[PDB]
Amino acid sequence: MKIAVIGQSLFGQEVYKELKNEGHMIVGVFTIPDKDGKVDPLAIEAEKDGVPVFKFPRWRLKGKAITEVVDQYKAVGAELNVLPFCSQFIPMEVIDHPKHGSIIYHPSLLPRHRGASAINWTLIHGDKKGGFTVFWADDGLDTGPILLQRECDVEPNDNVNSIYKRFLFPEGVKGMVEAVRLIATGKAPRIKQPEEGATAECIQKKENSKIDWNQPAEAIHNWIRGNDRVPGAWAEIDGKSVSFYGSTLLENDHFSSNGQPLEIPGASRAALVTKNGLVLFGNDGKMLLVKNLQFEDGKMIPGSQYFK
């Protein structure tokens, strides 16, 4: 069928590539403008194939759809919109235009974790199960009826990168391909999202990923891994913003060490720089271990190497 891919990232690129390879006609790719002279992976592949690329800065202006860009969109004659990691606001005029409307990839088990940082919140909340949903876009945010859903276990030390690389990305690509298959072959369902279990959270940015120290060790562990790598949980240390990566919980066989104390403003007590990384305390007397630290615009350095 005729598909417009509206989105970005290597995930968007892979979904484009697999749909193409399944015999679908990609009539257009609609992605973000160039930033720092880097073209989005989705745009790179499309161009290589001669598929038309569009890079709208915005689809809307003062609460009204920009007719000139909507018209460019409508001209490619999509029969279905596919939205992998679309970071743009898409007018309902566009969402509803194709005969099959639009499907969206969402990296959580809807109705839980609506919002653009669902992977982060899956981990921040310490969920035991995670996964993704392919759903039909409606006018709300991640509220449309479910086409399909796939689950995975969340590992205790999973960060955003590990669960994304292990499951959400490669199975997510397959799920999108399968969803289009079901649509083409005419049997895709529209399961209304249940009310029970619905949650919605905010977008994670550097600013709001600052560590709140007045939590138990386990919650701090979840906070750090839930923002690792991006945007990077951080705290001020010695006047400067330090980001934390590679968290594990630490309970026992202590205090071997001997650690070198590191004051962290707001921490329940001083941290310990040790051979195995940076030991941090929660407000419950318990410990976590951070393997890697990063300063602003910085390369990562091992927690063990803080004073060197």
Residue numbers in the entry: 1 to 308
Paper text:
10-Formyltetrahydrofolate dehydrogenase (FDH), which is composed of a small N-terminal domain (Nt-FDH) and a large C-terminal domain, is an abundant folate enzyme in the liver and converts 10-formyltetrahydrofolate (10-FTHF) to tetrahydrofolate (THF) and CO2. Nt-FDH alone possesses a hydrolase activity, which converts 10-FTHF to THF and formate in the presence of β-mercaptoethanol. The N-terminal hydrolase domain of FDH (Nt-FDH) binds folate and is homologous to glycinamide ribonucleotide formyltransferase (GART) and methionyl-tRNA formyltransferase (FMT), enzymes that are crucial for de novo purine biosynthesis and translation initiation, respectively. In this study, we determined crystal structures of zebrafish wild-type apo Nt-FDH (zNt-FDH) and its ternary complexes with the substrate 10-formyl-5,8-dideazafolate (10-FDDF) and the products tetrahydrofolate (THF) and formate.
The catalytic mechanism underlying the hydrolase reaction is also suggested based on comparative analysis of the zNt-FDH Y200A mutant and the structural alterations associated with substrate and product binding. Phe89, Arg114 and Tyr200 are highly conserved in FDH from all species. The activity assay shows that the hydrolase activities of the F89A, R114A and Y200A zNt-FDH mutants decreased significantly in comparison to that of zNt-FDH_WT. As expected, the Y200A mutation decreased the enzymatic activity by ∼62%, preventing us from examining the kinetic properties of the mutant FDH. We co-crystallized or soaked crystals of the mutant (Y200A) with the product THF, but we observed no clear extra electron density in the active sites of the structures. Our results suggest that Tyr200 might play a crucial role in the release of products. Finally, from our structures, we have identified a new key residue Tyr200 that might be involved in product release, product inhibition and additional THF binding.
